[PDB]
Amino acid sequence: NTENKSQPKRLHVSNIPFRFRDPDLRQMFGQFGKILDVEIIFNERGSKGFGFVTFENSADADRAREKLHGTVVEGRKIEVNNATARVM
RNA sequence: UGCAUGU
């Protein structure tokens, strides 16, 4: 064998507080700690209201999505959907 | 800024 059968890939992370960043998601998903990369969608005003993170393959990453999908932070529920990449 | 599948 020459390839990782379980490799992570990326994950849509919505309705987040507009004070969020890339390091904030990588640390907050970092409680579970399966992040390869992060990708906030950003505008000149703030976070644009969602990010992407590189995270999802195993059942523990599914469980982790299902936990942070409804996590109240700064008085706000995050909504962590699975992803397109990127055409639909 | 509450923009909704990508900086």
Helices (H), chain A: 22-28, 59-68
Distances (CA, A) of A27 to A4, A37, A38, A77, A84: 24, 11, 10, 17, 23
All structural domains of chain A: 6-88 (3.30.70.330)
Torsions phi, psi of A72, nearest 5? -85, 115
Return positions of chain B under 7 A from a protein CB: 1-7
Short-list A22, A15, A28, CA closest to A42:
A22
Q: Look at residue A56 and give its three-state secondary structure.
A: coil
Q: Experimentally, how was this structure solved?
A: NMR
Closest residue to B3 (CA, C1′) = A48
- C-beta of residue A53 within 8 angstroms of C-beta of residue A38: yes
| Chain A span 46-85 residues with beta carbon within 7 Å of strand B | 46-50, 52, 76, 81-85
Distances (CA, A) of A25 to A1, A4, A40, A57: 33, 24, 9, 18
DSSP single-letter state for residue A54? E
- Residue A47: nearest nucleotide (C-alpha to C1'): B1
